[PDB]
Ligand binder design. Sequence first.
Ligand SMILES: *[C@@H]1O[C@H](CO)[C@@H](O)[C@H](O)[C@H]1NC(C)=O
Ligand SMILES: *[C@@H]1O[C@H](CO)[C@@H](O)[C@H](O)[C@H]1NC(C)=O
Ligand SMILES: *[C@@H]1O[C@H](CO)[C@@H](O)[C@H](O)[C@H]1NC(C)=O
Ligand SMILES: *[C@@H]1O[C@H](CO)[C@@H](O)[C@H](O)[C@H]1NC(C)=O
Lengths: 50, 550
Amino acid sequence: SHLVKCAEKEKTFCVNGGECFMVKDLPSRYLCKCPNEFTGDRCQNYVMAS
Amino acid sequence: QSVCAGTENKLSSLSDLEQQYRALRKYYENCEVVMGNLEITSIEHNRDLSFLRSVREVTGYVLVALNQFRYLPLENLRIIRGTKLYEDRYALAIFLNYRKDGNFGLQELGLKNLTEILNGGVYVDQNKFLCYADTIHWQDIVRNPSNLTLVSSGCGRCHKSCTGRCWGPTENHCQTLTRTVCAEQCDGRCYGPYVSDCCHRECAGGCSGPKDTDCFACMNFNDSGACVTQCPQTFVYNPTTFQLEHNFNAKYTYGAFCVKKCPHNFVVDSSSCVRACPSSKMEVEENGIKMCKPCTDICPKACDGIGTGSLMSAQTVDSSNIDKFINCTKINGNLIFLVTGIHGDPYNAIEAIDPEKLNVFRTVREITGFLNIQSWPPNMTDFSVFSNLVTIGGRVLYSGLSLLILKQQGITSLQFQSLKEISAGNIYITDNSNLCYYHTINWTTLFSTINQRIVIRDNRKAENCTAEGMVCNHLCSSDGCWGPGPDQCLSCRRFSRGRICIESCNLYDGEFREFENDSICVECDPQCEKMEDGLLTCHGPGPDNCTKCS
Ligand SMILES: *[C@@H]1O[C@H](CO)[C@@H](O)[C@H](O)[C@H]1NC(C)=O
Ligand SMILES: *[C@@H]1O[C@H](CO)[C@@H](O)[C@H](O)[C@H]1NC(C)=O
Ligand SMILES: *[C@@H]1O[C@H](CO)[C@@H](O)[C@H](O)[C@H]1NC(C)=O
Ligand SMILES: *[C@@H]1O[C@H](CO)[C@@H](O)[C@H](O)[C@H]1NC(C)=O
């Protein structure tokens, strides 16, 4: 994988149960893996349909 | 003509990879113009992306990262405007589109029509199995300097006819150069190499002929098929008189268009459809038309909403900005309450909001954009803090919605007491398990357009509400109520004293006598003497309409 888990400092970065990840590339790019109920750059928004 | 919003997630995605794919399909299928960003991230090798062939234009940026599929089918994409850029620098970013193991990854880009990138640069790097992309003359596609326009073995050569610049192996894969190949007299793009073949200066992408009606895309505005720099203004200077004259062929600027009329919910300033009046001017209605006119003396208290001016950066109301709303009567923009607003955002050192502080909103009469309630203090059962809110303009929409109340367990009634108008957008009231009065409201009475829908799902069953006695007061009309009591009606069955519906006015008995202004009970002038023995104290307003003087 191109991704690694974030430090404990960056735990609170992703909200609403989002899992933080960094990218190994040479700055380092951060991302959130969201639970199905949430979205946004930091899982800050609720997913919605219909 | 089939527009969509697109995401703002960047590299963030859903943990469920099928849910991530299903979301991509949900957001972008049958969309021609992405009015924002086209983000394609973390998509598996097997996946079908044929639906992306629908995309012709992207307003913001194109992010294609961390995917494993062989080919990118954006075969109809012509323009990336780059109004918003990835990392505030790239209009197109294609990177890490392979699995580190080394099995599969992106091999070919189907961007044979991508001939314009209006603003921003190109970042195509770290794509282990991508071929031909190295041959692309990006300098031709990017319209303006962007000190970042670069592409970073065992790849097939371009076809002979391609002139060493192609997207794939065949003779039908050649890169169409539309700028560098032009006659020295073309200032824009071209469809050939002679002076006959130049595009109009207003064409974006390319053209099929010399006229401003022959463009593939417009550089600025579209005025009835003609690509224009600006719309016909209301005033026109006459050079011989040295005076401005009325232009009767004037049109209004709305988005990227010259329109015969502004939407009803929008304000007219100059010959343009705007969302807000300048701080110096005030909104006024003249024959149903909202306009910006200079302030009498002092301008009304209009406040920046979430994502506007002083609060451009903001995503939600929080403890750091709740105080920027003291004494606001109008909100120029939106009001959004996210989970991280109500319950605090620890990472950015923002404490959870003080529920008492939500009372700042009791002064708010109008919200020009939208109202988005995704979070609310648990001890609070209703939105009575919005007891004075009359209008939601819907001049800005969140996925076509102007009102959102979702996932709120603590709410049992709404209590939007003063609410009378939702000018644009749809309503989305879902998953508020204990909400009870919503099902009685004839939301239709609040709408302006007939295109306005209502999405009410998974709140407390209407049958369950009724059986638990959560019904409207008898003095409410068939239009419904916001919650319990006579003060909470949408309209009265009989009379009304202020905000409360009553059976009759104080005509013959009561501390303060009243006359009936047709269903509205108005108190008699203090100078009118309290007439006893079945006599009326007054027969209208003011001291002139008294029965006897005190
Ligand atoms: C590319 O653009 C042209 C004109 O804008 C249109 O004819 C076409 O459907 C797209 N071309 C291909 C080969 O998909
Ligand atoms: C301009 O607008 C008309 C609709 O008013 C549309 O048929 C045509 O696609 C447009 N031209 C360009 C170049 O976008
Ligand atoms: C708000 O207005 C009230 C009276 O309507 C006044 O007491 C107060 O100074 C104002 N406060 C702020 C913070 O604007
Ligand atoms: C309320 O919903 C009704 C059904 O009784 C529909 O006719 C109408 O558009 C709204 N009625 C009025 C009288 O505004």
